[PDB]
From Swiss-Prot, chain B:
This is Sordarin/hypoxysordarin biosynthesis cluster protein G. Part of the gene cluster that mediates the biosynthesis of sordarin and hypoxysordarin, glycoside antibiotics with a unique tetracyclic diterpene aglycone structure. First, the geranylgeranyl diphosphate synthase sdnC constructs GGDP from farnesyl diphosphate and isopentenyl diphosphate. The diterpene cyclase sdnA then catalyzes the cyclization of GGDP to afford cycloaraneosene. Cycloaraneosene is then hydroxylated four times by the putative cytochrome P450 monooxygenases sdnB, sdnE, sdnF and sdnH to give a hydroxylated cycloaraneosene derivative such as cycloaraneosene-8,9,13,19-tetraol. InterPro entries: NTF2-like_dom_sf, SnoaL-like. It holds the Pfam family SnoaL_2. Keywords: Antibiotic biosynthesis. Pathway: Antibiotic biosynthesis. Gene3D superfamilies: 3.10.450.50. GO terms for biological process: antibiotic biosynthetic process.
Length: 136, 133
């Protein structure tokens, strides 16, 4: 399982590689079915409701592309992952305009399979109004 | 110094009682002069630059009132304070129309006087556009 901050950061990179692929069939590899997610005022319980919300947002922002990087991750004695990095988005119809904001993810893992059971993402969404006006 | 999460929480509560007063002469009580601050796209180095950025931001939302709560604070072996809570904002002209968003603070302390030398605030500022109406 996850025992060091470098293992924690590698898992977070893997998690966002999956999320940013929008391959929804692979979300269950790293996210618990009972995932408790909070992203600002967006809040869901259950992996199905998480996927629905992402899908509802991909319909409102056609051509949306996202990527993530991280540079500083701590794994605490309580098992909490704090991972600071950046969130990037652009529209395929205008690939030159990229919006980037700092972001931090707070994660709790399932004690059996090591999937994310709690995921709280903090970032400022106001800059993304430069892409599309139908944000989460 | 800071040794328990309870002490970390109380310091963060004191820090935002100073920040939410907007008494810029008191900021230097809890913020180091070399403060490295990041709040979304806003990024400042030095306490004077931080005060100027907060001044500029408040000057365009006259009547702004802010407060902060917290429910989950961790103090790590590295001395990092992660504090999850909420950020509230309203206008003095309509004090019952409040916008509240979740917010997390990342803090690092000066080992000599205990003031904040690194403060990185993460929240969504988009909902606060509702205050302009």
């Amino acid at each position: 399982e996850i025992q060091t901050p470098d293992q924690a950061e590698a898992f977070v990179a893997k998690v966002f590689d999956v999320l940013d692929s929008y391959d929804y069939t692979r979300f269950g590899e790293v996210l618990s079915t009972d995932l408790k997610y909070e992203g600002g005022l967006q809040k869901t319980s259950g992996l199905d409701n998480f996927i629905n919300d992402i899908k509802a947002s991909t319909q409102r922002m056609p051509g949306l592309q996202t990527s993530h990087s991280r540079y500083r991750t701590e794994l605490t004695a309580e098992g909490t992952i704090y991972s600071e990095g950046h969130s990037n988005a652009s529209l395929e119809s205008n690939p030159g305009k990229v919006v980037t904001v700092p972001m931090i993810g707070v994660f709790k893992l399932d004690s059996e399979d090591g999937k994310i059971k709690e995921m709280r993402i903090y970032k400022d969404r106001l800059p993304f109004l430069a892409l599309h006006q139908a944000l989460p």
